[PDB]
Nucleic acid binder design. Structure first.
Ligand SMILES: [Mg+2]
Lengths: 110, 56, 295, 131
DNA sequence: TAATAGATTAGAGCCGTTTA
């Protein structure tokens, strides 16, 4: 439904993110909706200049200061764009599946 | 064509424009402000043109 | 030397949360050793620093950062040398599952210079204060009173405790000792023993590694080699596994910082802090008793 | 060869009823239990101390990264973690321009007069002590 | 009163910031 692209200094010129952004703009053109791709600018050193052409045309969300204000911008933009019962238990059970698999107490005699 | 457009300096003058827009919507008039109604992740200049010369 | 504690003691009369911040902490870059790196090298911990103080602020602004997961009143008491002054810190679970983590204050004065044991009258007063605090919070008397300290409980104070207590209330006394020289290493890996392991010595005594390697952090709560804390059930009847689990839970209440866990019970640490603050200045009737005025 | 039992690490609860192990990850994932609306910061100190606290608060609003992030998790930001405003532009400042006793009484009197006389409410006073 | 130990107890200080 939406494509948030991180717009840090490293994340705006790397090859993989560039190709993902390119196919994102292609599917945006296919979907004929301008409310698809959202840049999240987080990096103090990276100004609104020097940013990639493929995202320079679009309106970024200011995550440079107070990441939570950018989070609120993301939330009310999603509500304004009809982006489709919130349950934090899903994230609670998902946090240790991926982020804690090399970091756990596995049974082994020591 | 039924819309009101308010242009302003973005970094400095926001409180006045926000208050003016809020009062205008309270009065029933439809308004468009870049710090209130300009969507995120959208070509801002193209939408400003559309609002200015299409519905204003 | 006694600047912070006496500031807080003088501020105890009029209830105002306060946080003391040394200028060398907030901006450690500009203060230097005059011949190289700054005096307080906080580069590796700056974000962690920005964590801890934030929680401290959020703790002293009336916010509850986290709860714990009934009918058990933990009472950790610590002795202060001046005459001796015993000051305690209590916690339990409210009927709404809220973590009541107030104190047990109004320090009790044992006149002996080195007897870290409360007199029968002072022990009775401390215990009954804890029981009525529990009564007014949970509407009922506690089912079990897990009373712990860094000192062994002598016979006369134990008798005072069990005569001031009411019926159907089992209280067990626990002794926590730090710096006990049992340096258990790990033969295979280069990282010390993982945190949470317990070596049982007796049905009443054991060594618990409340600090050490944390699998979740891929590192250690303690530099060098961890020092297990000795947990002994000197008084009362309780299961040592249950006591170890409860004390591991109590090692999660460190609201004075934001750290995965601390090596000693937070009840004892906070009782020590409030006792030092109380002994810093003159006697004050009915101290505030909530830790936001001390930590 | 004595057997070492294991006590499962206790889980601390957070907002919405979710429990986590590390206070940092739990705070940055679900947030604190109760919500306060913000911190009315009070500063008691010299002008340089106020400037230092101002700068550090402004840095606190934005994320700060540890040198090693896997062991000690980073700070997403106070507004990101706790969800209550602690901006630096809402500070009640009190400037200061037996020796320990008098140094203590200076800040004590400042806090007493600012909490008694001043109309601005301070959730918690931060004694920014020089060095 | 002094001393010689062990067991506990308590303070204070002091540096590093948890091996990737
Ligand atoms: Mg503290």
């Amino acid at each position: 439904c939406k494509f948030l692209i991180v717009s840090s200094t490293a994340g705006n010129k790397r090859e993989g993110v560039l190709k993902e952004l390119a196919v994102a703009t292609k599917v945006k053109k296919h979907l004929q909706d301008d409310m698809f791709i959202i840049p999240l600018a987080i990096d103090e050193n990276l100004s609104y200049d020097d940013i990639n052409i493929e995202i320079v045309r679009l309106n970024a969300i200011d995550f440079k200061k107070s990441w939570a204000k950018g989070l609120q911008d993301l939330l009310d933009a999603f509500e304004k764009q009809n982006v489709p019962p919130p349950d934090h238990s899903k994230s609670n059970l998902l946090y240790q599946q991926i982020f804690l698999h090399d970091k756990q107490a596995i049974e082994k005699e020591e | 064509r039924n819309k009101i457009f308010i242009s302003h300096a973005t970094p400095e003058d926001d409180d006045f424009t926000r208050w003016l827009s809020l009062k205008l919507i309270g009065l029933g008039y439809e308004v468009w402000c870049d710090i209130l109604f300009l969507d995120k992740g959208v070509d801002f200049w193209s939408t400003i043109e559309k609002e200015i010369r299409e519905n204003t | 030397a006694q600047f912070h504690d006496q500031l807080k003691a003088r501020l105890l009369e009029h209830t105002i949360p306060t946080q003391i911040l040394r200028e060398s902490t907030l901006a450690w870059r500009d203060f230097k050793n005059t011949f190289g790196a700054p005096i307080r090298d906080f580069s590796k911990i700056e974000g962690h620093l920005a964590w801890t103080i934030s929680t401290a602020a959020y703790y002293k602004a009336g916010g509850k950062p986290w709860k714990l997961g009934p009918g058990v009143c933990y009472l950790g008491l610590v002795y202060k040398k001046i005459q001796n002054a015993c000051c305690a810190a209590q916690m339990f679970l409210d009927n709404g599952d809220g973590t009541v983590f107030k104190g047990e204050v109004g320090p009790w004065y044992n006149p002996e210079k080195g007897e870290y044991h409360l007199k029968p009258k002072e022990a009775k007063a401390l215990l009954t204060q804890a029981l009525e605090s529990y009564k007014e919070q949970n509407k009922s008397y506690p089912k079990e009173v897990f009373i712990h300290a860094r000192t062994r409980f002598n016979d006369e104070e134990w008798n005072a405790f069990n005569e001031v207590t009411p019926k159907n209330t089992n209280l067990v006394g626990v002794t926590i000792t730090k710096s006990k020289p049992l340096k258990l290493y790990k033969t295979e890996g280069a990282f010390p023993i993982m945190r949470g392991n317990a070596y049982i010595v007796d049905e009443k005594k054991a060594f618990l590694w409340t600090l050490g390697f944390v699998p979740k952090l891929q590192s250690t709560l303690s530099m060098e080699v961890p020092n297990p804390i000795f947990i002994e059930i000197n008084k009362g009847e309780a299961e040592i596994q249950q006591v170890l689990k409860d004390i591991l839970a109590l090692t999660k209440l460190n609201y004075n910082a934001c750290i995965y866990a601390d090596g000693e019970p937070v009840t004892l640490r906070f009782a020590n802090k409030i006792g030092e603050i109380l002994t810093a200045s003159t006697e004050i009737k009915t101290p505030p008793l909530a830790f936001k005025y001390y930590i | 060869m004595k057997e070492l039992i294991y006590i499962e690490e206790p889980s601390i609860l957070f907002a919405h009823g979710q429990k986590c192990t590390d206070p940092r990850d739990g705070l940055a994932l679900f947030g604190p239990l109760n919500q306060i609306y913000g911190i009315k910061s009070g500063v008691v100190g010299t002008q340089k101390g106020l400037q230092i606290f101002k700068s550090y608060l402004d840095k606190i609003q934005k994320p700060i990264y540890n040198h090693n992030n896997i062991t000690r998790p980073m700070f997403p930001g106070f507004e990101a973690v706790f969800g209550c405003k602690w901006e630096s532009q809402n500070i009640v400042f009190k400037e200061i321009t037996k020796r320990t006793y008098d140094l203590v009484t200076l800040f004590n009197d400042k806090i007493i007069t600012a909490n008694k006389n001043d109309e601005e409410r301070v959730d918690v006073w931060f004694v920014i002590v020089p060095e």
